[PDB]
């Protein structure tokens with residue numbers, strides 16, 4: 001417990017018992033007694049003035065304007081501008097940085113991450129009027145229209161996703177507040193508990209760097225260190241000798257979130273907070289220019305989430321729905337999480353709670369879900385810290401337990417107001433380049449590539465952001481197919497089938513982008529037909545995928561009356577590896593549907609192919625209403641609008657809600673007295689030509705995709721308008737359950753788009769794309 005002299009913001013760890021002088025010492029109440037005195041000098045502010053140029057060095061000043069300051073590494077960021085007639089970085093023209101211009105001794109371009117809390121993507125519209133430095137970074141660098149945060153759209157899940165490339169369910173920081181039933185402890189911004197490493201999973205970038213010999217401190221700063229001091233400390237660290245200097249740095253600003261919450265996102269009061277951020281950015285760049293590192297360093301300007309208009313009057317109370325609200329604990333606000341108030345309560349029943357919250361009031365501004373029924377695109381279920389009951393709250397509303405600020409965030413990560421920013425500037429990024437919106441889970445890989453690091457396993461798709469960089473150290477390669485398909489001929493007689501059923505240029509046309517590869521061990525059959533092709537699993541007794549193409553002027557027919565209950569045995573597949581219709585009769589709850597729609601057959605003769613037992617899938621009657629509407633009405637609609645479409649459809653089994661393809665052992669439900677497994681979800685991937693004037697089967701250029709993962713539910717309680725015509729609700733339900741192709745690949749162990757005219761990086765970008773319907 002001595003002194004900090006010569007050790008301010010030192011990069012080593014010290015003690016215990018010895019006192020600390022590092023940038024987190026205040027957070028551990030461990031700074032040496034003279035830390036405030038030596039290390040947090042504030043005298044005379046942060047800006048040089050003409051008066052002070054060539055002053056005699058006074059050790060009391062926050063920063064210096066003396067002739068030695070540049071030797072000493074501690075000039076104010078504007079010193080050269082005020083005293084040498086240099087220009088502020090923002091006043092110089094954009095000049096493309098073809099190669100890193102670094103001082104001798106630098107082995108890689110440093111990375112600086114400048115994260116802003118609550119920075120809404122639409123704030124970039126306010127432009128160089130308010131934020132000339134940010135606008136310049138955006139303009140001369142690489143930028144997206146916006147970047148998608150993860151759900152929940154709160155700070156800590158997003159900050160730690162940025163650093164790990166992991167979903168909150170994987171990294172463990174699933175909210176700003178959490179309860180962990182195994183630890184029997186709670187995590188909050190206020191508390192000792194957040195300091196235990198046990199909450200923090202994955203491998204953040206600082207650890208990835210350090211384990212691979214790249215110097216990198218933890219990204220957190222003690223909040224009591226002012227913004228200007230942090231910037232000066234980063235600058236001083238960048239002046240260190242080669243053997244002590246870090247290659248990655250982080251700055252966090254709590255603005256403009258703090259003002260967003262008070263005044264709302266569209267308040268006139270937001271201008272000054274944004275001017276203040278921009279001034280801090282200006283300090284960093286001016287400082288970098290002072291050190292001749294301004295064409296050496298890569299800078300990421302990134303937000304964690306946006307901000308919405310939310311007032312106290314738009315609050316739903318659970319007391320208006322639940323007779324007994326004091327038996328529950330609620331994590332409230334822009335999402336809901338419900339659990340039992342006490343584990344001692346044995347009458348506590350989740351099903352009664354869900355029923356009592358489901359579709360009661362006409363305007364109802366939240367929706368309850370068991371977490372395994374949340375849209376799969378959220379990836380918000382596979383963690384014991386996420387409560388079984390979840391409430392999705394409508395944008396602009398809160399939920400609270402009982403009745404006894406005007407901006408908020410935390411909503412569904414596809415909501416517009418939740419979108420945030422991304423700008424990359426420096427030698428490794430492209431120059432003056434706009435890139436499409438992408439998800440913040442993808443940045444960890446990029447940051448690894450900017451630092452020559454091997455990423456730890458994460459949820460980014462490595463290579464899908466290659467188009468952001470001038471130089472790509474990572475070239476992705478298609479995974480090798482693991483199981484090769486069988487091609488069964490006509491073997492069996494119809495008399496060999498005891499299934500209890502009764503009835504009264506394929507590849508080039510129907511697999512436009514090639515055959516999906518199966519990336520796990522299994523046994524499956526390719527089945528060709530006039531209107532569609534399929535990969536039929538002999539283990540699961542149904543298609544893994546079914547693929548077909550519908551031209552712009554293809555025609556919809558009905559299932560004629562006499563084939564209504566038609567299921568025909570498939571002579572290419574053995575009785576032993578087929579479904580049977582007897583199981584469906586014996587299952588009172590379960591009906592069946594088809595993957596290729598009989599509705600879209602090319603002829604009445606081809607229509608018979610649709611009724612094969614090998615095109616059949618278990619479907620709840622409730623779900624058939626959704627599925628029939630998609631197949632009969634929507635598929636044709638999309639083919640019209642997009643000038644034909646290619647459709648790949650299939651089952652998903654995810655009983656343990658981990659976003660990954662279930663093994664047989666992990667399947668928990670079968671059609672009554674059979675071993676026909678019941679899917680948890682059904683997917684479709686719908687592809688066409690981005691240029692819609694070119695039809696889907698003759699496309700020269702980029703592709704356009706939209707997909708979904710529909711949950712396979714025995715009721716339509718999710719849809720509060722489901723007692724009406726399907727035209728009133730199925731499509732809204734589908735859009736809620738929009739998905740990336742990549743989500744489907746994880747859920748099915750399939751790899752799509754193996755045969756295209758496009759680069760594989762471009763295909764990785766196609767597979768990460770999400771159609772949000774915003």
Ligand SMILES: *[C@@H]1O[C@H](CO)[C@@H](O[C@@H]2O[C@H](CO)[C@@H](O[C@@H]3O[C@H](CO[C@H]4O[C@H](CO[C@H]5O[C@H](CO)[C@@H](O)[C@H](O)[C@@H]5O[C@H]5O[C@H](CO)[C@@H](O)[C@H](O)[C@@H]5O)[C@@H](O)[C@H](O[C@H]5O[C@H](CO)[C@@H](O)[C@H](O)[C@@H]5O[C@H]5O[C@H](CO)[C@@H](O)[C@H](O)[C@@H]5O)[C@@H]4O)[C@@H](O)[C@H](O[C@H]4O[C@H](CO)[C@@H](O)[C@H](O)[C@@H]4O)[C@@H]3O)[C@H](O)[C@H]2NC(C)=O)[C@H](O)[C@H]1NC(C)=O
Nearest residue numbers: 169170171172201202203382383384456457458459659746
């Ligand atoms: C998003 O991307 C994720 C990352 O790839 C995917 O998540 C992974 O999923 C797999 C498959 O389900 C899962 O694998 C299981 O792992 C069990 C062991 O779990 C512990 O160890 C791992 C490994 O830690 C090291 O590697 C990870 C990356 O995975 C890295 O981030 C770590 O820092 C650590 O790094 C060190 O080692 C590596 C080399 O291994 C070095 O390269 C590196 O330099 C480091 O030195 C940890 O990930 C686990 O972490 C979980 O649990 C802890 C403790 O509770 C949590 O704090 C943490 O948040 C995390 O929790 C999440 O995952 C668990 C499941 O693991 C969930 O229950 C939970 O809700 C959270 O979501 C553990 O510390 C292993 O026993 C198990 O083995 C079984 O299957 C195999 C199959 O071969 C069989 O052989 C056996 O019979 C077993 O039955 C299985 O292998 C990974 O753990 C998991 N990783 C992460 C980070 O979550 C995710 O699926 C993907 N999502 C989607 C939708 O695609």
Ligand SMILES: C[C@H](CCC(=O)N[C@@H]1CCN(C(=O)OCc2cc(Cl)cc(Cl)c2)C1)[C@H]1CC[C@H]2[C@@H]3[C@@H](O)C[C@@H]4C[C@H](O)CC[C@]4(C)[C@H]3CC[C@]12C
Nearest residue numbers: 113115159160162163194195196197200219220221250252
């Ligand atoms: C949870 C606290 C931090 C409290 C806080 O609200 N800090 C604010 C908001 C963001 N801040 C910040 O500087 O953010 C930088 C940042 C940027 C980006 Cl892009 C991503 C990320 Cl993730 C962060 C200023 C912190 C303080 C100390 C932390 C612990 C470490 O001292 C030791 C280890 C390090 C391991 O990697 C993780 C576990 C560990 C115990 C840390 C847990 C989190 C602690 C307690």
Ligand SMILES: CCCCCCCC/C=C/CCCCCCCC(=O)OC[C@@H](O)COP(=O)(O)O
Nearest residue numbers: 015016017026027028029189190191192195223
């Ligand atoms: C070598 C000495 C070993 C350590 C001695 C520890 C002394 C025992 C006291 C423990 C409680 C607090 C000490 C550790 C963390 C200090 C907490 C702190 O200073 O931050 C409070 C935090 O909520 C503020 O939340 P926000 O400001 O809202 O982020």
Ligand SMILES: [Ca+2]
Nearest residue numbers: 654660661662
């Ligand atoms: Ca699974």
Ligand code: NA
Nearest residue numbers: 584587590591
């Ligand atoms: Na039935």
Ligand code: NA
Nearest residue numbers: 716717719722
């Ligand atoms: Na309903």
Ligand SMILES: [Zn+2]
Nearest residue numbers: 117118155304
């Ligand atoms: Zn935040």
Ligand SMILES: [Zn+2]
Nearest residue numbers: 118257261409
């Ligand atoms: Zn906030």
